C-alpha cells in the first residue's frame, strides 16, 4: 500500500512544493508591467523605472 509513510511524503511535498511555488511566484507581475527584470530594464529610462 502507499498509505503508509504518508506524512513524511507530505512534508517532502510541502518543502518541495513550497520551494517550487516560491520559484514560480517570480512569474507573478505584482502590479508592474512584467515580472521579468529585463523588460523593466529595457522598456524604461531609470527615473520612470
Amino acid at each position: 500500500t502507499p498509505s503508509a509513510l504518508g506524512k513524511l511524503q507530505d512534508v517532502v511535498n510541502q518543502n518541495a512544493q513550497a520551494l517550487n511555488t516560491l520559484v514560480k511566484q517570480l512569474s507573478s507581475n505584482f502590479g508592474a508591467i512584467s515580472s521579468v527584470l529585463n523588460d523593466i530594464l529595457s522598456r524604461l529610462d531609470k527615473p520612470e523605472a
Binding site: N38, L41, S42, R43
Partner: protein, 48 residues
C-alpha cells in the same frame, strides 16, 4: 487658416503604433560584438 494661433493650430504627421518586447528579433539596433567565452561571467545581449 494661415493665422490659427494657440488652441486651433493644425497637425500634419503620419501616425503609427509599435508594441515592443513582444516580437521576434528580425532587425534590431546594434551594439559591439565580442567572442564566445565559456566558464566566465559575461554579458549576454538579445533584445535588450
Amino acid at each position: 487658416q494661415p493665422t490659427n494661433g494657440v488652441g486651433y493650430q493644425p497637425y500634419r504627421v503620419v501616425v503609427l503604433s509599435f508594441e515592443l518586447l513582444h516580437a521576434p528579433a528580425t532587425v534590431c539596433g546594434p551594439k559591439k560584438s565580442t567572442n564566445l567565452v565559456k566558464n566566465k561571467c559575461v554579458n549576454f545581449n538579445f533584445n535588450g
